[PDB]
Amino acid sequence: GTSKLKYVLQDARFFLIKSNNHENVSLAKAKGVWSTLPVNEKKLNLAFRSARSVILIFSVRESGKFQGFARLSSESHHIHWVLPAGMSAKMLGGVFKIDWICRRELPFTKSAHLTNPWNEHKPVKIGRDGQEIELECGTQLCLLFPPDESIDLYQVIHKM
């Protein structure tokens, strides 16, 4: 009822994740892992040791929707990802363990009022993979997601 969620998002860092396919997100939602290119891998690692929470907000390219958001529980570490054109297991080699906070979709149409000061105040749906979102903008975007009844926040809060 927002109280638990607001405590989790308190002093958090927010990053957009863009996936080239639906299957890797379905995979990530089940096993609680994610991997990204080394550029974004470094940033999330720096962000993990620095912030009380690091939140990843997912969107499949060309879906028109966010598919959910998750909190890193570990920095990356060295998963049968569906590798897109340009494949290299090693490129996506580091595996972040993530705890999902919401696995339900949020259409871009519901976040049209929210813009990101850290991306030239462009609408928050706009950004490349790894685009960091300013605290309040990312907090509001997370609050727009519907409650996920499959999710129990106890293990996230317990790890904090």
Which residues are known binding-site members?
Answer: 18-20, 34-35, 81, 129
**Model resolution, angstroms:** 2.3
Experimental method: X-ray
Identity (one letter) of the amino acid at 107?
Answer: P
Q: CA-to-CA distance for 54 and 47, rounded, in angstroms?
A: 7
CB 81 within 8 A of CB 34: no
| Beta-carbon contacts of residue 69 (< 8 Å; ≥ 6 apart) | 55, 56, 57, 58, 100, 101, 102, 142, 145
Domains annotated on the chain, with CATH: 1-160 (3.10.590.10)
CA dist 16 and 69 (Å) reads 9
Instruction: Quote the tokens at residue 54.
Output: 């690091």
CA-wise closest residue to 16 among 68, 57, 51: 57
| Alpha helices (H) in the chain, listed in sequence order | 3-8, 22-31, 38-50, 135-144, 154-158
Single-letter residue type at 76: S
- Report the 10 Å Cβ neighbour count for 148: 15
Which residues line the annotated binding site for RNA?
18-20, 34-35, 81, 129
Distance CA 30, CA 111 (A): 25
Angle 38-92-119 from CA coordinates, rounded to 5° = 50
SS3 47: helix
In this structure, are residues 34 and 56 in contact, taking their beta carbons and an 8 Å threshold?
Answer: yes
- In angstroms, the CA 100 to CA 97 distance is 10
